[PDB]
Design a protein around this nucleic acid. Sequence first.
RNA 1: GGCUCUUUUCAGAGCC
RNA 2: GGCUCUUUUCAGAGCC
Lengths: 225, 225, 289, 289
Amino acid sequence: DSYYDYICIIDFEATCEEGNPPEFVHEIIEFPVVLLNTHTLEIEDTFQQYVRPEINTQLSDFCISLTGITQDQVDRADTFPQVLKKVIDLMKLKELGTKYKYSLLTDGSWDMSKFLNIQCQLSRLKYPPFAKKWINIRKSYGNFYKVPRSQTKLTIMLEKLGMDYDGRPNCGLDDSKNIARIAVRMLQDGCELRINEKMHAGQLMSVSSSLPIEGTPPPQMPHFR
Amino acid sequence: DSYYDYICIIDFEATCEEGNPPEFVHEIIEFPVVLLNTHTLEIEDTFQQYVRPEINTQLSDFCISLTGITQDQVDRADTFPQVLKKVIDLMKLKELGTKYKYSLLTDGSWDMSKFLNIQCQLSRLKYPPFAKKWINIRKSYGNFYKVPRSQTKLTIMLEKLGMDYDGRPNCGLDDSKNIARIAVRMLQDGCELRINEKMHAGQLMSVSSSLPIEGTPPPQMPHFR
Amino acid sequence: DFSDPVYKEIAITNGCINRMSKEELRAKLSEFKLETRGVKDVLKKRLKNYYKKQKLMLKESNFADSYYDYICIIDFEATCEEGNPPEFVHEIIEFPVVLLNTHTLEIEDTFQQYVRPEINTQLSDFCISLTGITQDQVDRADTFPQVLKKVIDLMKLKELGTKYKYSLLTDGSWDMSKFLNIQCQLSRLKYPPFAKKWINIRKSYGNFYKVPRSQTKLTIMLEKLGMDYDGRPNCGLDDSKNIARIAVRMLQDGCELRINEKMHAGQLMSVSSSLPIEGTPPPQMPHFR
Amino acid sequence: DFSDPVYKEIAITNGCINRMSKEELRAKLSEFKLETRGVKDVLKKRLKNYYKKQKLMLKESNFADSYYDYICIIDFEATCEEGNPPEFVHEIIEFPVVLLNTHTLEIEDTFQQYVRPEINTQLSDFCISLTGITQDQVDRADTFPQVLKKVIDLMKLKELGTKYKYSLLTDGSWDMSKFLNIQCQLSRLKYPPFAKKWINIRKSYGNFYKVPRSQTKLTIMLEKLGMDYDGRPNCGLDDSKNIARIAVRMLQDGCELRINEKMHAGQLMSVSSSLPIEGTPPPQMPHFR
RNA sequence: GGCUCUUUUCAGAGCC
RNA sequence: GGCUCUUUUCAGAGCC
Ligand SMILES: Nc1ncnc2c1ncn2[C@@H]1O[C@H](COP(=O)(O)O)[C@@H](O)[C@H]1O
Ligand SMILES: Nc1ncnc2c1ncn2[C@@H]1O[C@H](COP(=O)(O)O)[C@@H](O)[C@H]1O
Ligand SMILES: Nc1ncnc2c1ncn2[C@@H]1O[C@H](COP(=O)(O)O)[C@@H](O)[C@H]1O
Ligand SMILES: Nc1ncnc2c1ncn2[C@@H]1O[C@H](COP(=O)(O)O)[C@@H](O)[C@H]1O
Ligand SMILES: [Mg+2]
Ligand SMILES: [Mg+2]
Ligand SMILES: [Mg+2]
Ligand SMILES: [Mg+2]
Ligand SMILES: [Mg+2]
Ligand SMILES: [Mg+2]
Ligand SMILES: [Mg+2]
Ligand SMILES: [Mg+2]
């Protein structure tokens, strides 16, 4: 059974607040995409788009300080459904899921299980089926390098692999590009990154590594809920 | 018997070739002056002037790299007699030799006994009587800290006293400033720096330790030979 | 003329900093190695000026950059016979696009589509040997119009011509003035206005590095810049990618890569060197004739 | 237009690099940390462009640096009585000059001359207590014109107004508008045009750091910048030095200290901030009238 | 290489 | 503090 031909790295940036309150309703404000070719370990496509939040329109000073995304940036931006549509259109042009086997990769579980999960509700979109399974790279890294969860933060991962962060930290595209560097190194080291997490009934579950390598469905624009 | 009120640091830069040939006719190309108040251990005056050589007008590739002095800085520069007149004007304004007891101080002995000595002859000037004796700080440093001559290079003197060089090495001013830093530290350490070198009949001679603290005559612009 | 959009940014940041507390100011100040001693209003003005210095330094960053934001590299592969007979009708069989960001100097997009020829549908032994494109590939492939639409869909997605200034870059004049020219006639498509002008890297390389025209071949250009060929030669996408490598090296060396060849009434002409640096229009899928 | 003097300087440099050997190129290019791989011509053009991107960049900011090169800091001390009586004729008793290099932010010159008063020749008890200047110091001092001459000689020697752009700077307006003004009258000297305008650092501090005029005293300005007084308070030279410490700090925080005050028909006037940054004329020893 | 324009003319920018 | 100018207007530059 063959390996994924492509990996999509997605690192959402979202509205936020000092202290990171637990019950805060996050809204995606940046949608970066990095297409890594697993055969050649080259980045083939990078797509960055800012997302205009409808509920919390005005970004907090703390959010501006952390992510680097300005108010003007999210004002001149499309709304999430339009951004998502554009991201899928890129994925369809690359023929992911039809010609090439592919997976989604995120730095942790929140990106997909929280950010996308909540944003889709706020955008009145059904959860796109193609995004229900993914590679959590922290999970992979933790399992492959035998380190606790606490030692899997983006900075630390790069540090333990002889790398400095490349670009502006918390600029979604830059995080994705740096996550890509980890995914490359891990593949070079011999860890064939497997889909290890899933959304089922809206609650986060682990994907068994005993299960065969399975492709992510070809992406489709989810219909309005 | 009272000490000097001012120490007058001069570190000439001169025209030169790769390998420092012995018989080379040097021409002053930079005339820095750092005026140090011995009572307050503070630099009161800083004065840097480039000098346009008349014989060897074009600086060598080696000379330009060593000193950092560019060809154009030399072209727009005054000739030596005009530069010297200006330096003397400063010393007169500061009332050196009239109101205040002073000495010249150099890093080594070449500055007065070789550079100035030769440069005067080339510029058709008598040797300035006020520049006949000076403090060789390498001689002072070598005697006070009891190190051989080999360990009295500007950069080594700084390291031994826990210092890093400030600015660009072989830039006359930066040199003079750094030499003044060694001068200050040595005065703090307890070495009452005194004139230890002179010229007599164009011959380089030593000035005795036990000879009382004598000042230097008030500077005069020398008459043409 | 504070009318520059950079100033509204500074106004937004200054107010953001005016809200900051003595501690927040002292914090963000230590983070930039700036002096931390003083009073609220001192620290406030100091930090405000740092962000002013930074933004203005950054916005005036026009070194190793092009006036175009993107350079869109295309190297068609077309049907061919051995010995290149004079009257063989060429058809594009590979449409690679390598989109180069001109500021970051990274390839932001690579895109490869194969094309099913409809005239000489059956590829030649030589053609297969040269391009490395199997008969099976062109058989499964879409019609040229369909492929062009896809290519345009990519350009529209990356906002070329609308939000970003861009131009097409080609190794030689053949791709646009010949292959696409002939192909559009065959596919009965009006020649797309976005492809009427472009950069000929051979022209650019020739009079930048002062080399004769016979020495501006793809393999030679690379061997001259001190680099070997990446991937398989004569393969569109890999050609384009290696072309993009030359393009970068040149922008780094400080070549203002400029549109040098237009096409007017099916006739290849050169664009004047002295004429103002102009950007390609936004791409549109051309209509049938 | 290309007719600028810089372009002739590049041509000699270009010819200098056109003679450089393939060994000399890889060596010099590595020294600038630039990529050294390639062929004779590629290395040649690469190095040629760096000397072009350096000499045009250095000469761009040569005309962009239209700011002063020197700030010339003077703080007069003058005769005074207890309680500052209204009709007491003031005379300058200390002429201190602190010359600050704006580029290096280092004090290049400190110069102190005492002045012998000829109206109220005997110093006040209060005056000596404040300024810390004994009778013996003024008795042995020179007259004001001789002192002003010596101050101008120092300024000519440092080439202020001829080779270097410069402005005078004082704590308050008093120094020029009151003390020097009264002194030139008394000495029967024409008021020197080089002192007809200056920087009042109190106006400059208040505007830059957003503080009331009541807060703009010398000891308070220092305190608000998180620094204490160096030397003896009310001693002209030491004052000038601490004022220079403020100037440096302000220049570091991005404040372009500009002339904001002038004399005109004996009246103190304010100078427009929007007015282009003009430097003071080269000093001249005024004639008697 | 063949050219053609340019006080960047020990040099620059092109063209077939 | 009080004012005054300015599409840097959640800001900027000045004045008494
Ligand atoms: N320290 C933090 N405080 C508050 N929110 C955060 C913090 N770090 C990350 N976030 C949120 O998580 C999003 C993605 O961050 P990251 O997990 O670094 O990709 C950000 O856009 C924030 O909304
Ligand atoms: N390594 C060297 N080779 C040739 N000349 C030198 C060298 N070091 C110093 N000089 C000459 O001495 C002058 C200043 O010497 P110094 O004060 O020792 O830097 C320079 O301007 C040179 O002319
Ligand atoms: N030696 C050749 N003989 C015949 N056709 C060629 C040759 N080289 C290139 N071509 C044609 O030009 C297309 C692209 O090659 P290139 O112009 O080298 O990028 C190919 O698909 C061929 O149709
Ligand atoms: N409290 C005061 N009473 C009378 N005169 C003063 C007072 N403070 C300063 N002055 C005058 O202002 C001159 C210098 O002021 P300053 O430059 O502010 O130190 C002194 O020489 C005095 O003549
Ligand atoms: Mg993340
Ligand atoms: Mg992130
Ligand atoms: Mg020396
Ligand atoms: Mg030296
Ligand atoms: Mg080609
Ligand atoms: Mg090709
Ligand atoms: Mg004062
Ligand atoms: Mg004072």
